[PDB]
Design a protein around this ligand. Structure first.
Ligand SMILES: *Cc1c(COP(=O)(O)O)cnc(C)c1O
Ligand SMILES: *Cc1c(COP(=O)(O)O)cnc(C)c1O
Lengths: 365, 365
């Protein structure tokens, strides 16, 4: 009664202007197409209003809105998948709710009950169940967002906020049983986040500044940015992805490594999962630890590196075959080693996500 | 870039819903009250549209707007002052245009011609001329904003943007001829910007994360945050203000020092001006150098510190009498030394800003 909105009070408003779905020919470029409905909940000094599913529509915002002046905004990104039996499922939606909540706190935005939001999302996706593609490799992208909405140029804790969710079908990222590597630009010139910063939260502010760097990565001939940090150029993340390395370490032990959640990297859901899986298999050392370019160069020379890749909801797993550093093109042997591990990861997630094998990680819609 | 919009094509829609000025006894709380009109220019596939002054109104934005997901937003803050002859004037508006433009480039937003925007702003202020307060110490706050407006969840260079300006009368911050100090929280726990970061640009993303820390500063019993950086806790800025110190250095020379424009600092307009003035007077060493808490502690005990303060458009100059560091309350002698330096700076700016003495820094409206 001044804490959280409840799914039980959700309000439905089916559209009166259904939109033509992307014909079976239609491309489906990442975030360019949206479904018919959206979720919407308002918050002010009266607590949350009633959550409501409404037709997709513009946002009406006051010119002084803090979401626009002081970046009082955060968002989440997760996927729902439709299996061959056309049942739709989310991938560990809970971890996303957690993260959203944590970001919400960092920006002094109002908290809410994750189960209620999750259910509300489940109701929304349900409403647009038809928008979920089901061609192999495709999915529905779930975009929850929360922004401060005070019509005040004061940089204070907002007293008015707004949470909303939008959905878009996304097409396949790789052919059924393979993957294609990407080249990375690695330049100390740019930092993405720092210690004591806010990079371990998914806030809009973390991304705005990457657009320029991303272009520099392309003009320089690469496709993504490997973010280096500190004086030893430690690897943090690869653009909107957590970085992983499968190699024989200096101590001669075969292991899967990924930078620790110090506070400069984002707690990827896929990231978590890949560790979970690997720790399960028990076939090799799985460790969270700092990785430095130094260690990487030497591991490359002595040929101890097998696979390098990033994790993320866009493709789950993505191979790396080239890293441009100090104007030096480093060939990464990922494809030459299978990529054995990447494919397994890829294969296991697909069977879990598309409902080939039942699993606790999947939240049915 | 595209060919800037031109003032000559400015389109004017006068309001039919004049809000009525704040009663002559109504608290001009910063960023709370807005005037009747706003400026608005759109940008897209076809370069800039026509700039237009229109009635203050909400912004209609697509749910996927990049200004809301990846913080593709920046803004500027400057003041216009009305003299007793009712002539309105801006304070070095050019430096603001420059800065705006630089921020615009860092986020890959479209460029525009500084002079055209300035004229457009001059036209808008002209239109709301009556909204500029006359009380000594008051002013009109000018808030230009530029945001990416791509209805796309893709984190790319926008192809659709929007620039707009809103205005609000602000009341006095100090009574005439005096000032009141503020206490600062100085904790290495929090970092505002980093080297190679984007703190030297006025981007919304820089601020969102300060709201929490600001509350912690009040909770700790302070009023503003002194941002410390690096391993030696070098002073960077004091919240939305540049920090200045008037002290005898370790070499025995009396000087006014302020952190250099190394990139972790915002190029304040007031900051620039205070240096210009001091440089002019030629009465003491004026320098841009790194300042470390170490140096400050030692100056305090040896008594070499006279005045400490920050610069910013909100109050021009603001005294500091206390800095809480390591749970240690440091008394700063600012008020005990006049504060002579601060008073002079405050006197000079007032006479320039309110048109008591003509000056090249003032841009008439
Ligand atoms: C999206 C993203 C990740 C990965 O998160 P997932 O939950 O796996 O989608 C990691 N780092 C950054 C900077 C990201 O944007
Ligand atoms: C507003 C601000 C300043 C001061 O700039 P002015 O142009 O003099 O107002 C300095 N640093 C930060 C972080 C600011 O927000």
């Amino acid at each position: 009664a001044s804490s959280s909105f409840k799914a039980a009070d959700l309000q439905l408003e089916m559209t009166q202007k259904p939109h033509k779905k992307p014909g079976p020919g239609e491309p489906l470029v990442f975030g360019k197409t949206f479904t018919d409905h959206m979720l919407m909940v308002e918050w002010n000094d009266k607590g949350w209003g009633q959550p409501r599913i409404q037709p997709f529509q513009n946002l009406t915002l006051h010119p002084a809105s803090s979401s626009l002046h002081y970046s009082l905004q955060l968002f989440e990104g997760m996927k729902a998948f439709k299996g061959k039996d056309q049942q739709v499922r989310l991938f560990r939606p809970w971890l996303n709710m957690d993260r959203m909540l944590r970001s919400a706190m960092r920006l002094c935005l109002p908290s809410f009950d994750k189960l209620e939001l999750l259910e509300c999302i489940r109701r929304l996706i349900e409403v647009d169940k038809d928008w979920v593609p089901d061609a192999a490799g495709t999915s529905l992208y779930v975009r929850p967002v929360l922004i401060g909405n005070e019509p005040s140029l004061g940089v204070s804790q907002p007293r008015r906020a707004l949470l909303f969710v939008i959905l878009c079908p996304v097409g396949a990222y790789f052919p059924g049983g393979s993957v294609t590597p990407v080249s990375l630009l690695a330049d100390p010139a740019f930092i993405r986040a720092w210690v004591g910063g806010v990079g371990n939260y998914k806030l809009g502010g973390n991304y705005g500044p990457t657009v320029l760097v991303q272009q520099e990565a392309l003009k320089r001939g690469c496709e993504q940015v490997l973010w280096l940090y500190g004086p030893d150029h430690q690897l943090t993340e690869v653009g909107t992805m957590n970085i992983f390395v499968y190699w024989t370490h200096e101590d001669g032990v075969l292991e899967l490594v990924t930078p620790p959640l110090n506070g400069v990297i984002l707690p990827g859901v896929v990231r978590q999962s890949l560790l979970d899986m690997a720790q399960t298999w028990g076939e090799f050392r799985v460790v969270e630890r700092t990785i430095t370019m130094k260690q990487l160069l030497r591991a490359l020379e002595e040929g101890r590196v097998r696979e390098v890749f990033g994790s993320g909801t866009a493709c789950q797993v993505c191979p790396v075959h080239r890293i441009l550093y100090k104007d030096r093109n480093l060939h990464i042997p990922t494809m030459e080693n299978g990529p054995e591990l990447i494919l397994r990861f890829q294969k296991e997630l697909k069977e879990i996500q598309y409902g080939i094998r039942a699993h606790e990680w999947m939240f049915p819609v």
